[PDB]
Amino acid sequence: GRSLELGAADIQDLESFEAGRGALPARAYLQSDAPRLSLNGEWQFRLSPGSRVAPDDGWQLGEALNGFESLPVPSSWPMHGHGAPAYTNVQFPFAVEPPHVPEANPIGDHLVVFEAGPEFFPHALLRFDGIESAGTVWLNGVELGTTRGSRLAHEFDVSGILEQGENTLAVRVAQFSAASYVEDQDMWWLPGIFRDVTLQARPAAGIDDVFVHAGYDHITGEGILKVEASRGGQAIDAVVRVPELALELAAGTEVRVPAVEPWSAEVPKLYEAAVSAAGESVALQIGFRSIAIEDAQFKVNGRRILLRGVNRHEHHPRLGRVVPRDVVEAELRLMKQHNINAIRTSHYPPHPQFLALADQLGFYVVLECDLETHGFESAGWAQNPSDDPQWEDALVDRMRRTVERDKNHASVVMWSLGNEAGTGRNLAAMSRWTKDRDPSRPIHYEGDWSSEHVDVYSRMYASQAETALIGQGIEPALNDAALDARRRAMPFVLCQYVHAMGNGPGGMSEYQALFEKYPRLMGGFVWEWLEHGITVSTADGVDHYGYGGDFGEEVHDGNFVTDGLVDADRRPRPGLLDFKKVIEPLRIDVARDWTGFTLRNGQDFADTSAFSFRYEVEADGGALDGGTVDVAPVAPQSETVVELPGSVAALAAGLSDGRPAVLTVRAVLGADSAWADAGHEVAWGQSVREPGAPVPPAPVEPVQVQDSELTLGPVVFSRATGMPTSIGGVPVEKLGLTLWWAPTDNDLGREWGGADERPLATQWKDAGLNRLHTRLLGISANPGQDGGETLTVRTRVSAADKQYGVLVDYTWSTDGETVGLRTQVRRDGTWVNRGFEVEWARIGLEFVLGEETELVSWFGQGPHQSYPDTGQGARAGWFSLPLAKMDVEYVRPQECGARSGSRSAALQLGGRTLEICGDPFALTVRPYSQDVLDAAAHRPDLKADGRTYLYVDHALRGVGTAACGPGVLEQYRLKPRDADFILTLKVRS
Amino acid sequence: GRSLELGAADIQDLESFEAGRGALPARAYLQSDAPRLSLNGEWQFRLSPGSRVAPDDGWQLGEALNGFESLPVPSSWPMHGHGAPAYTNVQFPFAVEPPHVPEANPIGDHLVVFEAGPEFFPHALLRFDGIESAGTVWLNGVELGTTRGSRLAHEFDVSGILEQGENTLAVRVAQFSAASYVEDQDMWWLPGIFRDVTLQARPAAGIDDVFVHAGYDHITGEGILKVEASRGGQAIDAVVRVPELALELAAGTEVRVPAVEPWSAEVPKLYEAAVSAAGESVALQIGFRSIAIEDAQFKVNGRRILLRGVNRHEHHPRLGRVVPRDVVEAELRLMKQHNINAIRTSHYPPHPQFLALADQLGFYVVLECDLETHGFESAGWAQNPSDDPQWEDALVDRMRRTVERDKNHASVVMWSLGNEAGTGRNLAAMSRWTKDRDPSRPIHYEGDWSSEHVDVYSRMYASQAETALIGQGIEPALNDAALDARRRAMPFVLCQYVHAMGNGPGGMSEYQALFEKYPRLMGGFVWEWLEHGITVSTADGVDHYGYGGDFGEEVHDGNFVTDGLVDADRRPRPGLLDFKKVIEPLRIDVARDWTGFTLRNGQDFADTSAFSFRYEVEADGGALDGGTVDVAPVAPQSETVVELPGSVAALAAGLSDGRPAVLTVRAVLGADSAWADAGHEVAWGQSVREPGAPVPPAPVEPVQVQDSELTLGPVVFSRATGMPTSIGGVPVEKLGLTLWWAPTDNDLGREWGGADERPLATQWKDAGLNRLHTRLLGISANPGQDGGETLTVRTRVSAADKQYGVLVDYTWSTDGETVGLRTQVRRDGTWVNRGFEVEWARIGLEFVLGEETELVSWFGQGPHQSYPDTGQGARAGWFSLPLAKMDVEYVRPQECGARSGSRSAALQLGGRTLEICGDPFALTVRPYSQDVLDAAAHRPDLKADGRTYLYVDHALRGVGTAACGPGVLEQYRLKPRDADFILTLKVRS
Ligand code: NA
Ligand code: NA
Ligand code: NA
Ligand code: NA
Ligand code: NA
Ligand code: NA
């Protein structure tokens, strides 16, 4: 019979296993003096729902365009109202049947008219730095070719096709193609021509490609320099000039520069250079550095380095995969400002302009090829393109374009084959190709744990325990003795760790101590730098971030795309403030007697001469003493004890007992740097003189009794419930025990440890911890002092359908001014439910007050939140914030905002002030309840109800990283137990 | 110190382990000529939230009532806006810490003024037939006592307290008490004075209690009669008269009536009798029957009986636990009309008036004590009141009041100790007490499988397989040899089986065949008779039923209270129509040659003389022949072959081949009965002459091709998709394969069989069956006949992120009038997901039509729905219903309304008619999509969208009873497989 379906030819091309056709050889991205014209700007665009209905109406000519409208290019076109973004993590959004594509496949036709002056003849090309996922390119109706590899560059010769004057460039882009099966990164699906489009003249006697080789001999101090230059794939005559080093040499010859200052992330020394032929000159920035593996350590310039890293996706909350240059520069500065020294380009090459900025600002870069096949894992990796010989040419092409583009940049210290792509013959082919092309950079790939085709051993989210075993070289052996010996000689990197989703990440300090202890450990890269929030404006014009499912997706992964150290607009999350402290490159340990501090220089290359060392003593009234102390430069990996002026110690000795005072020593930048202004804080340490325990008020005030109320000084109690209804005139609507919090993203994750396959959030719901009930057992007034009395209220807390509970006793006392509150908690019954021991989130009290709080002040840790396994960046001091600024604007609202280690607190309720003191407690204050917080999926769902929710916790659980990787470490868990704690309360005007 | 809490005395009483205080001895409910006054009517009512704030303001006197309002009594007070109903199944709504009660405990103060004439002096009492859960009673300010046992009667002597003329009765009712721990039935929590309140004069020389003993000697035909009569607990002189039997005897003497007609559910013969003393006469209805266990069979009057039973809760959708008498009478008639002969009073004694109606209409009754402690199971039965000696007196009191009230009623054939109360010493004490008081009725209790203290072996939801083993006496042995021998000599009853929640129950026929095969099997009681829906009126005034969670409950069990054979207003569900057929008491097997039918009388006592046997032959045009055939009475458990008139067989022989005709033989009531009018259908059987296969149209019409459309006779196809866009001018918006349906309540239940602990609904979601995607592979026109052509469209169906699929090929053909459609389905890949084989709900097609359907007609099974393991009550015939009447109004919308076994169908779309024919298919038609159906939680969420959703299924899965008990039996499951089926389509005006 006769074939009748439509669009079969277009679909066959989209199903191609091969790389793009018609492109020039892959090469470096080079700054050249050749004439160039950027075609970025306002293009014309038409969208069709699939190949079979994509018109074949000659639109490529620009004449009588039917159905086109203006669209910026570069762009991710769903960010501009054409379709919508869609988020999946691992799962494909289409049926898995490679190489076939779904019928619903957005086809975007792009068209731009431009003018080519005489400087673009006789030879020129068109460059495309990124098209997701399949491009077909026509110029003046003539097909140039196709693009595969969404984040890779393609160039097409236009000689004999480009015309003098007006030209018409047409590009048909398909969202889905066979290449989608190898681009399954955990991120938004966003088609478009999302990077630069450039016309570049190719003058005769020019330079097509350049390969910089700039090594460093750390013994002699020599630089080893060879700059290759080619045209049409052939080495050519060219002259290399490096003026700062008094150098003129031929391209292609290796020389020995007697002395060079070596490049590192800490000291990113770059030498300006130019390589030029008769027709073209290329400008280079040369950093001399050598990379080697020896004694199972990753070494640069002869030294083991510590990677303080993040995984960087490219995302912008309004432009999608288009990241404006100013945002790139700003976020790299922000990384440096938080002590980061390393970046993994998860999981594809970045915009080409990123490389020079990393060279300049100083980051160790893991440059990763555009390859991920994670969605094949759930079928046992059946049909995985990574092990399918039909995909070999396509995957080698991806690696070749990755390597060729960025090979000249000192910041790149490892090539990565891809991410979560299983094991297979094509990964081996990619590795062999890279090792042969560029032996100067070790190869990284986590997906094959046997590490057969790599030079470093990489894992993601390995526990602190397994990392310690690896650090000692005693992890279990591979079955193959030869492969085991190879891997045991490799250094070890965590390419992803301490998953930073929501409240968290907990457990960072335990990893860092191992990094410092064991040379084989290279460090780690946090997952991830940024949340992929997409800005949404609601009915009222109130902006907030959207995540998976908020754009009508049929299958999605929710807020797992919002898992970053900064939000999509680069505002730090608390996790980044903690991370900065965890990875600080200097350690400052202040002596308890305030005579001095131990200073350890944790850097690998630089001394301490860039830093100014400042001290300040702060007390309740303010600063009492402070200044700068001169420190002879301390070498990398060396230590010294720095004396503080005698006045500081003398001040500590004269302090009256119980008066709190904090000595803080900081290392700040002595001068402006390329990434921060002078005075920027890099490291700090403290010694605290703690306030004395608040003496409980003498119980000299008696209990006065009325039919329905009891009064004890400034406290009024309901006689029916035994609970206070007001304290100093502040209405108390509720007081009770808490054991639960609104689950974090981590609490919604499964702990793949133990026989319990429920997330902690589910364990808590099953146990009833979110719906506690209180029974009153009795109320008694007991003799106090000089006619005074204490009031003891006995209660039992439990939950419907449960037999376990806790006996909670409140003992109240007052001298008329201060109120004393002792709370005693005693376990009743066995706290087991559905066969497993119940764990608590906290041991604390919730005060619900009938008035709003405008201001929260405290002495403790701050300014930001802290939980048992977080809060490293929260330092001791006196803090005060408006109520709203106590919250944390996580995209999915969740437990957050607790200030652990508080010794005193003050809430301003309009005109009066409520003061809380006692042994250390955690402090949280909110204008809405925990049930409202738990129910809210986006921040607009949070609405104040005119009350104050005050949380005073005697104990808290950690937050961990159970959303992906380890849960809460054993020492931070909270099993049911007896407890007792004392508070004082005071209300003033 | 000094005690200061409030209300401690009230709470201490509520925590009492003891029975109520102050009541007269428990006795029978008796029809007496003693003067009586019902105090039912409009009372005054005040509600307090708990004991500690319940006023002690002297309200018991009726003077200056502060805060009282009118309330009907009897009532469940949350049904009248005081609080709200709350539904839990097993879980308690309060902390489990017996005997303690929560602080939130509705306290209802009831008050009524009444007048007592001289006939109520000097002696009278007040009777309360039910108070949930704790009552305290005052008369004229004087405390009478308290009530415990919510569904049990209490009487208080008011001699010397009742006054001539005006009196004031005050009752304080607490919702929760220690007794709540032993009243954990799966039902709504509903406090109130919910049964009659009566003043009764007690004249001197009267009769307090009566115990009827009326046995039957099945050998001699004698009745064995002894009527005991007592006053103040002492046997008294009284005369018993039974006029119909020519009897006058003294109370307390056993006599032998020479001949009596025995009582059974089938023939509920009752003799009017009176026992009288000088001061009082009591009217009785005496049914002579004897109960015995012999040869491991439960026998009445010397015959093993088959229980065709339901579990009857007391519920009314607007009045709660108050069931108006007219509703009781109507629903018992409805039970008889659906062949039911047995009732279990789950799980408490019914209203006292129920007993006489069961005597009269004829049901075997399992009368169950008010005891259930199910909520202790989840803590390993720790603290279970059933094994706590401190609860012995309270639990024996419950059993004593249960037995004493109803002991005179022939319909009661077993006493049940309670339900789901574990095992324990107090259950044994209850059994010992009952066996001693009334040896004439065997004891039932399912909670102790060892059956130590019972006379029958009872289970709930035992599988058909285990029931077959029990029926053969080869179930596994108990560890105790003595207890094993006892239990193996017991008959076996399913006190609850074939859970009737939502679409279902499936698997009824397999149980019934075992009941018929094995004498040891007594039968079973369906769970349950009625859905406990509560009527709710929404914003627009649209009524619907609410279930758990719809009334603000903190903990609840959702729609598990809507699990009945009839809805709360007693409208039959399809399950009741199927059940009636399953348990029909006669079997009618029509010969294939239409010469006669085999008639088996499945009754235990009655012959067939109450029935008229009618036949009718029906064809497309209408009835062709019919009449009545005289049948000599067939004895119980006997069989005969009844000849039909020769004209019927002659008609079958003359039928042209392929013409459909149905011979139906019915057994209807020959005369009015007490429960249905003459002509009521009891049993039926059929023989069908099936229509010949529709010959496919000759493919003489060719495919005409256009740029974007293909036309083949009356079918227009999209050339882009290959699917029809119209058939005979009827718009087709979508056509595709189906494998999924909107989960039933059963599909949301876990199959505790196999290693997969996901409900089927979850298995389907995980597998993507609800989100199928279709890829087009090709379209071809092939040579047909005489220039005609067929059109074959090749597709593959799968789901996002899955590698398995099905190849689906559509072959279209037409002669211009009729359209032929062949569908071929071929498995592609292994249909396994998350480690388990995927199961399908169906193999079918969904047509989405762009116009509404007003009427659906078909030849097949009807009128109601049928699935592979249901539809017994759906008979063969021609049916036609408005679209809305094809649906089933389940409270939670779910898959329903399929008509299996359809051979032809006709949809009326405005003016035109769409006809479907072919080999048997299942037919479903809806005005909304499956996704709308699945998302809808209540019926108002269903909204028509102006389309027609037509489902034609080649195969369906069964529905089972997985919500509670067995899932779908193996033979009704649907594993992925290849399939092929043919349809013809025709559109007319
Ligand atoms: Na991934
Ligand atoms: Na993520
Ligand atoms: Na939330
Ligand atoms: Na139960
Ligand atoms: Na139920
Ligand atoms: Na539904």
Residue numbers in the entry:
A (entry chain A), B (entry chain A): 22 to 1010
Study text:
Psychrophilic β-d-galactosidase from Arthrobacter sp. 32cB is an interesting candidate for industrial use, as it can hydrolyze lactose at rate comparable to mesophilic βDG from Kluyveromyces lactis. Furthermore, it exhibits additional transglycosylation activity, it catalyzes synthesis of GOS and HOS, for example: lactulose and alkyl glycosides. The functional dimer of ArthβDG has two independent active sites. Each of them is located on the top of TIM-barrel Domain 3 and is constituted of residues from both subunits of the dimer.
The question of the effect of point mutation of the other catalytic residue, E517, has not been answered before. The ArthβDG_E517Q exhibited no catalytic activity, whereas activity of mutant ArthβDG_D207A was severely depleted. As expected of the mutation of the catalytic residue, E517 into glutamine caused loss of function of the enzyme. Mutation of catalytic residue E517 into glutamine resulted in the elevation of the melting temperature of the mutant in respect to ArthβDG by 3.5–5 °C, depending on the investigated buffer solution. In the case of 50 mM sodium phosphate pH 6.0, it attained 49 °C, which means that it was higher by 4.5 °C compared to wild-type protein. The structures of ArthβDG mutants: ArthβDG_D207A and ArthβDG_E517Q, were solved proving that the point mutations within the active site of ArthβDG have no destabilizing effect on protein’s structure. In the case of ArthβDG_E517Q, only a slight change in character of the active site was observed —similar to previously studied loss of function mutant ArthβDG_E441Q. The inactive mutant E517Q was designed specially to enable binding of transglycosylation product—lactulose, in the active site of enzyme and thus elucidating the mode of its binding.
